Structure formats: C-alpha cells, structure tokens
C-alpha cells in the first residue's frame with residue numbers, strides 16, 4: 001500500500017485505494033446495536049475481497065427521530081448530539097474491537113464525520129453550546145441558504161442546528177475529536193459530510209492538524225443551478241465545481257460529475273465524469289461510486305433513501321467502469337454483500353490490482369463503436385473495456401496481445417488485458 005500525497009498535495013494516499021462503504025441506510029433498523037459485531041466478524045472477508053479501506057458509519061451517537069407521512073428515519077449518524085460512541089451501531093467497546101479487527105486485517109478505517117450541524121435540541125447530551133456566544137449559525141442574521149457571519153457555508157435545511165465551525169472553540173472541538181479518532185479508534189482517514197456547509201479550507205486545516213498524511217474524501221453534492229447567478233459556478237460543469245473544492249480542501253472528492261452522467265446521460269457520456277479527465281491532476285482526485293446510502297436503495301424499510309438510484313440494468317456496467325478506470329473507487333455495502341454482485345465485484349477488484357490501475361492511470365475513449373469503449377493504461381497491464389458495445393475484438397482499438405478478463409451480461413460487459 002503506497003502512501004503519499006498527489007503532485008498538488010491532495011491526500012489520496014498513494015492513489016491505490018479501493019474502498020468499501022461499510023454500511024447502508026437502514027443498518028440501525030435492521031442490525032440494531034450489532035453493526036460493529038458484524039464488521040468485526042466480516043473483517044477477514046472484506047480484507048480477502050481486496051478492499052484497502054472501509055468507510056465506517058458516523059461514530060458519534062445519534063438518537064434522533066423524524067417522520068413525514070410514511071417516511072421515518074433517525075439514528076444513522078447524520079444528526080448526532082455528542083462524541084460518545086455508544087450509539088445505534090454498537091458500543092464504544094465494540095467499535096474499538098471492530099476497528100482493531102479491520103486494521104489488523106490490513107483494511108484502513110475511514111470515519112464519516114459530520115461537522116456542519118448537531119442535534120441541538122437533544123435533552124441528554126455531553127456537548128452543550130449556548131446561544132449568544134457565536135457558536136451557532138443562527139447566532140447571526142440568517143437571510144437564506146448562503147454563508148452568514150456565523151457560518152461560512154450553506155446551511156442544513158433550516159440552519160438552526162448549523163454550527164459556526166470557524167469559531168475558534170468549535171474548530172478546536174472537532175480538531176480534538178479527529179485526533180482522538182486517530183489515536184484511540186484507529187482512524188486511517190475521514191469522509192467529510194456535507195462539505196457545502198463550511199469552508200473547504202477548514203478541511204485542509206483539520207487534516208493538517210490531525211491526520212495530515214491520512215486519506216480524506218469530501219462529499220460535495222451541489223449542481224451548478226444551486227449557486228447564485230453571478231457565481232462562476234452557476235455556469236460551470238459539475239467537474240469544475242468538485243475540482244475547485246478539492247484544490248482548496250486538499251482532499252480527494254466524490255465524483256458527482258460521473259454520478260450525474262450515470263443518471264442523466266448515456267453510457268457513452270460516462271466519459272464526462274471527473275475520472276475520465278485527460279489531465280491527471282484532475283482525474284486522480286476523483287472518488288467514484290455507483291450508489292451510496294442516500295442515492296441508492298437499502299435493504300429494509302422504504303427501500304431506504306433512494307434519492308438518485310442507478311437502475312439495476314446498469315449496475316454491472318457501472319461497477320465494471322469504476323473498478324477498471326482512473327480515480328479511487330468505492331463499492332456499496334449492498335451491492336457487495338446483500339444483492340449478489342459480490343462475485344462479479346471480486347473479479348474486477350482482482351483485474352484492477354493485476355493491471356496495476358491507479359488513480360492517475362491514463363484512459364482513452366474510442367469513438368467508433370457503440371456504448372463505452374476505453375483503453376486504460378494500468379502500470380502492469382493495459383485494459384480494453386467495452387460496455388454495451390458493438391466492439392468485436394480488443395485489437396480494433398488497441399495494439400498488443402489481449403486475453404479475456406471479464407465477460408458478463410451476454411457481452412454487455414467485456415474486459416481484456418494485455
């Protein structure tokens with residue numbers, strides 16, 4: 001496991017990671033208080049599957065609850081009230097056991113952190129920041145969903161639970177928890193939630209202070225039309241928006257440019273995500289996924305969230321693409337362990353590792369066939385990927401001797417290696 005910073009100093013940790021999203025949205029409802037036990041027990045399996053890192057749920061206890069019609073939720077970690085680890089995924093002790101087991105198996109532990117807001121109204125909590133001291137967004141005049149003097153980012157819904165993450169004392173509080181997580185809970189890095197809510201620069205700051213050499217990824221989910229008309233972003237591509245965040249936070253960023261193309265374009269348009277970018281300084285910072293806990297489905301109740309779910313007929317092609325191309329791929333717990341895509345994903349992980357494909361590997365797209373046809377220059381091997389294509393043989397688009405590596409869905413998914 002190679003470990004540096006990118007050439008622009010972005011925290012991609014060698015650019016050779018393969019991450020497992022370690023949970024689905026209904027875990028707290030389906031395996032109440034047992035998730036850490038399940039992970040401790042799966043640790044060897046996950047390591048054997050080829051993951052180099054796992055994205056753990058929010059460790060901070062969440063006893064929240066809500067309902068709007070048929071919809072109900074709460075306790076998943078996104079509306080935490082304390083830094084206490086005895087929440088709905090399991091106890092502090094189980095967490096330590098789980099992180100120990102994962103780390104011992106060679107999988108780095110990445111924790112999901114939610115600095116933007118907290119469950120302010122929760123009666124029994126260890127963290128109580130009063131009003132009028134500038135700890136909250138609403139301590140200032142809050143026009144709308146725009147930075148105010150008490151919060152330099154967007155707000156979460158109403159903005160009444162929004163923290164002034166820039167207050168010396170709030171910054172300090174997060175900083176110390178990050179360090180705690182690294183020193184006692186074996187953190188190998190962090191997944192930053194709702195990065196639209198606070199300054200990118202603060203993420204670099206927190207990283208610099210607590211885990212400068214660790215892995216980090218930020219979730220920036222905000223399309224051009226969400227910015228003000230006078231903002232250069234209102235007219236930028238999804239690629240430029242996410243890239244700009246990454247340049248400032250100095251952390252890889254989730255490839256929402258590829259996600260939007262997966263959802264709105266055709267397979268041929270997949271080449272427009274951040275990871276297909278011809279400049280390696282651009283593609284190397286992409287963190288690709290097919291679905292997450294918000295965008296995809298989840299076992300159990302309401303099918304989970306499914307805000308922007310990829311249709312089952314493109315799941316295999318979607319994974320074939322992310323596992324074989326540039327950027328850093330993330331595999332959804334569910335596709336891997338619930339829905340039976342496991343065997344397929346294992347093959348691809350193996351293909352990616354054999355070819356020596358990395359965050360900055362080169363990718364070329366071939367225009368003359370249907371579907372998506374790409375040439376990936378792995379460090380050990382070259383791969384030809386043809387998805388929903390009429391391509392006949394790898395030699396039509398590349399020079400060299402190719403063997404078939406993957407052939408699934410009646411040829412809708414084909415991968416060859418040199």
Ligand SMILES: OC[C@H]1O[C@H](O[C@H]2[C@H](O)[C@@H](O)[C@@H](O[C@H]3[C@H](O)[C@@H](O)[C@@H](O[C@H]4[C@H](O)[C@@H](O)[C@@H](O)O[C@@H]4CO)O[C@@H]3CO)O[C@@H]2CO)[C@H](O)[C@@H](O)[C@@H]1O
Pocket residue numbers: 064065066073074076077078079114156157158159160161193194219221293294
């Ligand atoms: O006090 C603040 C606000 O509190 C109340 O808001 C509720 C919402 O109505 C609920 O729908 C819910 O919100 C969830 C949300 O459903 C879910 O997507 C999730 O979103 C995360 C997401 O996982 C993450 O990956 C990324 O996109 O950031 C999001 C926020 O972190 O989690 C939310 C929080 O659990 O819960 C809140 C609070 O219970 C109230 O209705 C509002 O008026 C009020 O302003």
Ligand SMILES: [Ca+2]
Pocket residue numbers: 001002003012013014015016017
């Ligand atoms: Ca690495």
Ligand SMILES: [Ca+2]
Pocket residue numbers: 116137151152153154155156162163196197198
């Ligand atoms: Ca905010």
